[PDB]
Design an enzyme around this catalytic site. Structure first.
Site, mmCIF file in Angstrom:
data_model
loop_
_atom_site.group_PDB
_atom_site.id
_atom_site.type_symbol
_atom_site.label_atom_id
_atom_site.label_comp_id
_atom_site.label_asym_id
_atom_site.label_seq_id
_atom_site.Cartn_x
_atom_site.Cartn_y
_atom_site.Cartn_z
ATOM 1 N N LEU A 266 17.775 -44.859 -5.201
ATOM 2 C CA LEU A 266 17.124 -43.604 -5.569
ATOM 3 C C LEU A 266 16.542 -43.630 -6.975
ATOM 4 O O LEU A 266 16.230 -42.569 -7.530
ATOM 5 C CB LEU A 266 18.075 -42.409 -5.428
ATOM 6 C CG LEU A 266 18.438 -41.974 -4.010
ATOM 7 C CD1 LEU A 266 19.677 -41.098 -4.029
ATOM 8 C CD2 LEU A 266 17.274 -41.243 -3.365
ATOM 9 N N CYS A 267 16.387 -44.811 -7.573
ATOM 10 C CA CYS A 267 15.812 -44.885 -8.911
ATOM 11 C C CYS A 267 14.301 -44.706 -8.887
ATOM 12 O O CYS A 267 13.733 -44.124 -9.817
ATOM 13 C CB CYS A 267 16.182 -46.215 -9.565
ATOM 14 S SG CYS A 267 17.953 -46.418 -9.837
ATOM 15 N N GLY A 268 13.638 -45.190 -7.843
ATOM 16 C CA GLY A 268 12.194 -45.092 -7.760
ATOM 17 C C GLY A 268 11.522 -46.445 -7.796
ATOM 18 O O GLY A 268 12.014 -47.408 -7.200
#
Lengths: 130, 129, 285, 128
Positions: free
Chosen positions: C89-91
């Site tokens: 979910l960091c991108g």
């Protein structure tokens, strides 16, 4: 009358003015005073002394370096300890580091952080019919 | 008395989604969430057990002030139920005093205030939770 | 499109926004402490930075410029460090650093030099395992505020291989913290050549009590450890900023989805109630 | 035979949620999802190709008894077709035996259990 700085890889321990330094030098203990000649030296596992108007605080240094200059004396000690907290027996900081830290700082975070990832993941397949 | 109740309940509802993450939150946010949970547990009521106006006034005064904070959330209802018995038996006069001046413009008052404070302190000291 | 199935969609997506809303601020809270830890560690790195500058100026002989500082000739095998967030979910941060590492690996193999990677965090560890290029050293389950001891399990192995001649140069790939919105991957040399951009400060000379060689051999392993420690800590701060950005984007995307679903739910109910009155009027006649 | 099939397929549908996002699951979950994929792909029957009771029973017995674990998912259909060819040519007698005693209370008779698992192993040795 020389600016002392005890800096550690995690944080800064102390940055006040110091009268005398009883540094544990590799070859032999040396004294460091307000206007000492330039010096930078390795330390060994030992017990460094700081004198405050006749009072001695055993900032035992697990090890590191020390750069002395006629203006200031920074402690590059890679690892330093303190004979405070009942000679580390009380270890109040370590006590918190055991409970207040290393218990709720990350372990509580990790279980909560992973838990959010769960109810995030499971709901997306539950809404995977749009 | 209930203005603070309504405000705290609204604040807790604003943070209701953080109930299961209250541990890793702000201290004031955690305190607000704890207060809201305690209030909701207090508002839980059994069936066929009506509470007169003076008793509800006393309960809400105890809840709004920092008195139930030491009491755990799951035991708030039993705390209230036991405190009602304490008022009904140990201090029958404070309930009548509250009921007599319920219409006074200044609800807090100085006398009723000290009477109810003393009753709450006595109950909390005698009881353990 | 049954005026009730959309209601479940609205409820589910509204939950997603609420979860992501919590996700956005918890990373921001950890972002604040990660930046705080970076600031606290800065004096330790900065103070010894000119010490390298002072020391490197003093020692000039190539023969005595031994151990780590040796600028080896005919480069053969370089070990590179990748630091990755443990969770997702960091991108684009995870993709960017892996792409940066992938480009670096291909460039070195074109040069004819074999490569090795030491990974921090599970994300980098599995990515290279799936690629088939197994990392020799890994360090996962790193905390939000890890200590220097945690990275010693990898740094010591890298330096020992460097000293033994297994590795002739050493690199790190870390998510550089440019701003709260931009987290670009960065490449840094770890071979302790010198750090005199500080102009060696006063460049004051010293009397090396243990000796020139002893001080040099005891400071170079510490210097790279501090550089790795800062880079990992910088990556942690960059990770939280990237996760914060991803959640804020996701929350806005979720909120946009709620409004889009609300209109469809609203239209369906009017369509349903329009029917609901339709046949009963027709049945009446 | 099909009770295990239905249970495993339902479990696989349950774990599809973890399959879609999480990739850190332990080996047991990985093999569980793999077996679910084996089964669901095995259900990918073509058109105008009915299968008698004995054929489906034998295929499901082979799949449920972990004889099909090593076969990759894209090749499972071809594996099954080749297994049917093997049964129709090499061992029609096992098909006859399976069809003859499909009504018995305990189908996995040792007589039925043999000459079928042996046929499965012979086919596995023959192909890949």
């Amino acid at each position: 009358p020389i600016h002392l700085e005890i800096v550690t890889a995690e944080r800064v321990i102390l940055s006040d003015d110091v009268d005398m330094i009883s540094a544990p030098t590799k070859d032999g203990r040396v004294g460091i005073l307000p206007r000492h000649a330039p010096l930078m030296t390795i330390l060994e596992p030992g017990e460094l002394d700081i004198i405050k108007n006749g009072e001695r605080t055993p900032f035992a240094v697990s090890g590191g370096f020390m750069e002395v200059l006629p203006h200031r004396v920074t402690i590059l000690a890679d690892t330093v300890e303190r004979a405070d907290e009942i000679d580390e027996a009380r270890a109040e900081q370590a006590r918190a580091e055991a409970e207040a830290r290393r218990r709720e700082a990350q372990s509580e975070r990790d279980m909560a952080l992973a838990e959010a990832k769960l109810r995030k993941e499971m709901v997306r397949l539950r809404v995977a019919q749009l | 008395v209930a203005g603070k109740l309504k405000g705290e309940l609204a604040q807790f509802r604003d943070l209701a989604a953080f109930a299961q993450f209250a541990s890793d939150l702000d201290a004031t946010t955690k305190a607000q969430i704890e207060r809201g949970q305690r209030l909701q547990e207090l508002l839980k009521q059994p069936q066929y057990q009506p509470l007169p106006v003076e008793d509800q006034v006393a309960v809400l005064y105890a809840a709004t002030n920092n008195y139930l904070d030491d009491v755990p959330v799951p035991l708030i209802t039993k705390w209230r139920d036991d405190f009602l018995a304490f008022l009904r038996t140990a201090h029958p006069e404070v309930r009548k005093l509250i009921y007599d001046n319920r219409l006074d413009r200044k609800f807090p008052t100085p006398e009723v205030k000290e009477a109810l404070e003393a009753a709450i302190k006595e109950f909390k000291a005698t009881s353990n939770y | 499109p049954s005026s009730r199935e959309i209601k479940r969609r609205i409820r589910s997506v509204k939950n997603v926004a609420q979860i992501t809303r919590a996700m956005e601020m918890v990373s921001a809270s950890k972002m604040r402490r990660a930046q705080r830890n970076v600031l606290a560690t800065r004096p330790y790195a900065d103070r010894m930075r000119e010490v390298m500058a002072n020391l490197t100026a003093r020692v000039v002989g190539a023969a005595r410029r031994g151990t780590l500082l040796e600028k080896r000739e005919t480069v053969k095998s370089v070990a590179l460090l990748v630091v990755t967030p443990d969770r997702g979910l960091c991108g684009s941060l995870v993709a960017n650093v892996l792409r940066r590492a992938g480009r670096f690996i291909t460039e070195q193999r074109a040069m004819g030099r074999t490569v090795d990677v030491y990974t921090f965090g599970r994300k980098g560890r599995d990515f290279f395992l799936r690629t088939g290029f197994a990392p020799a050293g890994e360090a996962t389950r790193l905390g939000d505020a890890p200590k220097l001891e945690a990275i010693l399990g990898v740094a010591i192995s890298a330096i020992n291989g460097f000293q033994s001649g297994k590795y002739d140069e050493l690199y790190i790939i870390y998510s550089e913290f440019i701003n709260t919105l931009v987290q670009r991957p960065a490449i840094k040399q770890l071979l302790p050549v010198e750090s005199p951009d500080i102009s060696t400060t006063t460049n004051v000379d010293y009397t090396y009590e243990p000796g020139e060689e002893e001080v040099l051999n005891s400071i170079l392993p510490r210097y790279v450890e501090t550089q790795i420690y800062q880079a990992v800590l910088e990556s942690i701060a960059s990770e939280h900023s990237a996760r914060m950005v991803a959640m804020r984007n996701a929350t806005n995307n979720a909120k946009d989805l709620v409004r889009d679903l609300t209109l469809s739910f609203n239209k369906a109910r009017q369509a349903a109630i329009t029917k609901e009155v339709s046949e009963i009027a027709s049945g009446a006649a």
